[PDB]
C-alpha cells in the first residue's frame, strides 16, 4: 500500500543512515545491503 | 516461451518499462521497438504510460 | 419520445430510478383513461340510437 | 398535474449530476498541478546526477530514488486517466438529459416508440452509482497525499546529501 | 397563416437553443483541460454572414 511505500522509504531512511555510516571510518564495521546493484 | 533476462542479477522485463521507440538487448542481439496496435495502446495508456 | 431518448446512455449511466418508475405509471394511467373514455362513448351512441 | 411532476424530477436529476461533475473537475485540476511539480523535481534530480561525474554511494542512491519517483508519477497519472473518462461520460449524460428536458407539447419531430417498456440487463441502482463515484474520487485523493509526501521527501534527501558533501 | 408562423418560429427556436448548448460547452473549458488538441491551421478561417 501507499503507507507501505512510505515505509519502504523509511527503510530507505535507515539505509541513508546506513550509507552515511558506510561513509565513516574503517574501524566502524558495516556491511553492504540490497540497495547496491548493477 | 520463457522469461527474458533484463540484467545480470536475474530480473525480468516487467512490462512497466516499455514505451514506444526504445531499444533492448536480449541474449546478445539488440532490438529497437517501432510501434504498437489498438488494444496495446488502450491498455498501456490506461496504466498511464505516455 | 422521452422514454425512447433516455436509452442512449453509454456504459454505467442508467439508473432505473424514480423518474422511470413514475413515467411508467403515467403510461399506465393514459392507457386506462383511454379505455374508460371509449367505453363511455359506446354507451352514449347506443342511447342516442334509442332516442331516434 | 402529471406533466408538471415529470418536469420537477427532470430538474432534480439535472442539478445533482451538475454538482458531482464540478467536484470531479476540482479534484482533477489539483492533481494536474501536483504532477507538474513532481516532473520538475525529476529534472532537478537528473541534473545533480550528471553533475557529480566531476563517494560512490550517492550515485546508486540517487538512481534508485529516481526509480521510486518514476513509480509514483506512474500511479498519479493512471488515476488521472480514470477520473478523466468518468468526467467525460458524466457530461455526455447531462447534455442528453437536458435535451430531453427541453421538449414541450408542441416541439416538432415527436413520434411513437416501438418497444421500450421493460428493464434491460446491465442496469444499476443509485447506491451502487454513488459508491462508484465515491471510490474513484477518494482514490484520486490518496494519490494527492502520495505526491505531497514524496515532494517533501525529495527535497529532504537532496539538501541532506548536498550538506554532506 | 397561423400554421406558417408556428413553423417558422419553431425552427428558429430549435436552432437557437442548439446554439446556446454549443456556447455553454464553449465556456465550459478551463486551463489544463481534457479536450485539448494540437490541431493546426484554423486561425485565418471563416465563412460567415
From Swiss-Prot, chain A:
> Which compartments is it annotated to reside in?
Cytoplasm, Cytoskeleton, Cilium axoneme; Cytoplasm, Cytoskeleton, Flagellum axoneme
Q: Which family does it belong to?
A: Belongs to the CIMIP2 family.
Stated role: Microtubule inner protein (MIP) part of the dynein-decorated doublet microtubules (DMTs) in cilia axoneme, which is required for motile cilia beating. Binds to the intra-tubulin interfaces.
How it assembles, according to the record, is: Microtubule inner protein component of sperm flagellar doublet microtubules.
Protein name as annotated: Ciliary microtubule inner protein 2C
Please name the source species. Answer: Mus musculus (Mouse)
The major lineage groups are:
Eukaryota, Metazoa, Chordata, Craniata, Vertebrata
Per UniProt, what is the name of the gene that codes for the protein in this document?
Cimip2c
Q: Which residues of the full protein are shown?
A: 40 to 77 of 200
Swiss-Prot record, chain B:
Give a short account of what the protein does: Microtubule inner protein (MIP) part of the dynein-decorated doublet microtubules (DMTs) in cilia axoneme, which is required for motile cilia beating. Microtubule-associated protein which regulates cell division and neuronal migration during cortical development. Necessary for radial and tangential cell migration during brain development, possibly acting as a regulator of cell morphology and process formation during migration. May enhance calcium influx through CACNA1E and stimulate programmed cell death. Overexpression of EFHC1 in hippocampal primary culture neurons induced apoptosis.
Highest taxon in the source lineage:
Eukaryota
Please give the first and last residues shown and the length of the full protein: 151 to 200 of 648
Instruction: Kindly provide the name given to this protein in its UniProt entry.
Output: EF-hand domain-containing protein 1
Q: Whom does it interact with, and what assembly results? A: Microtubule inner protein component of sperm flagellar doublet microtubules. Interacts with the C-terminus of CACNA1E. Interacts with alpha-tubulin.
Record's subcellular location: Cytoplasm, Cytoskeleton, Cilium axoneme; Cytoplasm, Cytoskeleton, Flagellum axoneme; Cytoplasm, Cytoskeleton, Microtubule organizing center, Centrosome; Cytoplasm, Cytoskeleton, Spindle
Curated annotation (Swiss-Prot), chain C:
Query: Which compartments is it annotated to reside in?
Result: Cytoplasm, Cytoskeleton, Cilium axoneme; Cytoplasm, Cytoskeleton, Flagellum axoneme
Superkingdom, natural source = Eukaryota
**Where is coiled-coil annotated?**
18-52
The UniProt PTM text for this protein says: Ubiquitinated, leading to its degradation. Deubiquitinated by USP16, promoting its stability.
Complexes and interactors: Microtubule inner protein component of sperm flagellar doublet microtubules.
Function, in words:
Microtubule inner protein (MIP) part of the dynein-decorated doublet microtubules (DMTs) in cilia and flagellar axoneme. Forms filamentous polymers in the walls of ciliary and flagellar microtubules.
The UniProt entry's sequence similarity note says:
Belongs to the tektin family.
Q: Specify the protein name.
A: Tektin-1
Organism annotation = Mus musculus (Mouse)
From the entire protein, which fragment is shown? 315 to 366 of 418
UniProtKB/Swiss-Prot annotation, chain E:
Expression (tissue specificity)? Expressed preferentially in testis. Expressed predominantly in late pachytene spermatocytes and early round spermatids. Expressed in spermatozoa.
Result of knocking out the encoding gene: Sperm with reduced motility (47%) and forward progression and increased flagellar structural bending defects. However, normal fertility is maintained.
State its location(s): Cytoplasm, Cytoskeleton, Cilium axoneme; Cytoplasm, Cytoskeleton, Flagellum axoneme; Cytoplasmic vesicle, Secretory vesicle, Acrosome outer membrane
Q: How is it modified after translation?
A: N- and O-glycosylated. Ubiquitinated, leading to its degradation. Deubiquitinated by USP16, promoting its stability.
Residues of this chain annotated as glycosylated in UniProt: 31
Role: Microtubule inner protein (MIP) part of the dynein-decorated doublet microtubules (DMTs) in cilia and flagellar axoneme. Forms filamentous polymers in the walls of ciliary and flagellar microtubules. Required for normal sperm mobility.
Protein family (similarity comment): Belongs to the tektin family.
**Subunit and interaction comment:** Microtubule inner protein component of sperm flagellar doublet microtubules. Interacts with TEKT1, TEKT2, TEKT4 and TEKT5. Interacts with CCDC38.
- What is the name of this protein? Tektin-3
Q: What organism is recorded for this protein? A: Mus musculus
Portion of the full-length sequence here: 246 to 294 of 490
Amino acid at each position: 500500500s501507499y503507507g507501505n511505500t512510505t515505509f519502504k522509504y523509511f527503510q530507505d531512511l535507515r539505509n541513508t543512515g546506513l550509507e552515511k555510516s558506510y561513509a565513516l571510518l574503517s574501524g566502524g564495521c558495516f556491511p553492504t545491503i540490497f540497495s547496491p546493484n548493477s | 516461451r520463457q522469461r527474458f533476462t533484463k540484467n545480470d542479477m536475474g530480473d525480468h522485463y516487467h512490462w512497466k518499462d516499455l514505451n514506444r521507440g526504445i531499444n533492448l538487448t536480449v541474449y546478445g542481439k539488440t532490438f529497437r521497438i517501432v510501434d504498437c496496435d489498438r488494444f496495446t495502446q488502450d491498455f498501456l495508456e490506461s496504466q498511464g504510460i505516455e | 419520445t422521452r422514454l425512447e431518448t433516455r436509452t442512449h446512455r453509454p456504459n454505467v449511466e442508467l439508473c432505473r430510478d424514480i423518474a422511470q418508475y413514475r413515467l411508467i405509471k403515467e403510461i399506465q394511467e393514459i392507457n386506462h383513461n383511454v379505455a374508460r373514455l371509449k367505453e363511455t362513448l359506446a354507451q352514449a351512441q347506443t342511447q342516442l340510437k334509442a332516442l331516434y | 398535474k402529471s406533466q408538471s411532476d415529470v418536469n420537477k424530477k427532470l430538474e432534480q436529476r439535472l442539478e445533482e449530476v451538475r454538482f458531482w461533475k464540478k467536484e470531479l473537475d476540482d479534484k482533477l485540476e489539483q492533481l494536474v498541478n501536483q504532477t507538474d511539480d513532481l516532473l520538475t523535481y525529476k529534472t532537478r534530480l537528473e541534473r545533480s546526477l550528471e553533475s557529480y561525474k566531476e563517494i560512490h554511494g550517492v550515485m546508486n542512491l540517487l538512481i534508485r530514488t529516481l526509480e521510486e519517483s518514476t513509480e509514483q508519477i506512474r500511479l498519479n497519472r493512471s488515476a488521472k486517466y480514470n477520473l478523466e473518462k468518468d468526467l467525460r461520460d458524466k457530461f455526455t449524460a447531462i447534455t442528453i438529459d437536458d435535451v430531453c428536458f427541453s421538449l414541450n407539447n408542441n416541439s416538432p419531430n415527436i413520434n411513437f416508440s416501438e418497444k421500450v417498456v421493460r428493464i434491460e440487463p446491465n442496469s444499476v441502482s443509485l447506491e451502487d452509482w454513488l459508491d462508484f463515484s465515491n471510490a474513484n474520487v477518494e482514490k484520486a485523493d490518496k494519490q494527492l497525499n502520495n505526491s505531497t509526501a514524496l515532494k517533501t521527501l525529495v527535497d529532504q534527501i537532496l539538501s541532506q546529501t548536498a550538506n554532506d558533501l | 397563416s397561423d400554421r406558417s408562423a408556428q413553423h417558422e418560429l419553431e425552427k428558429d427556436l430549435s436552432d437557437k437553443q442548439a446554439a446556446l448548448r454549443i456556447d455553454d460547452k464553449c465556456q465550459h473549458l478551463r486551463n489544463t483541460s481534457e479536450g485539448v488538441s494540437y490541431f493546426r491551421g484554423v486561425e485565418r478561417v471563416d465563412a460567415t454572414v
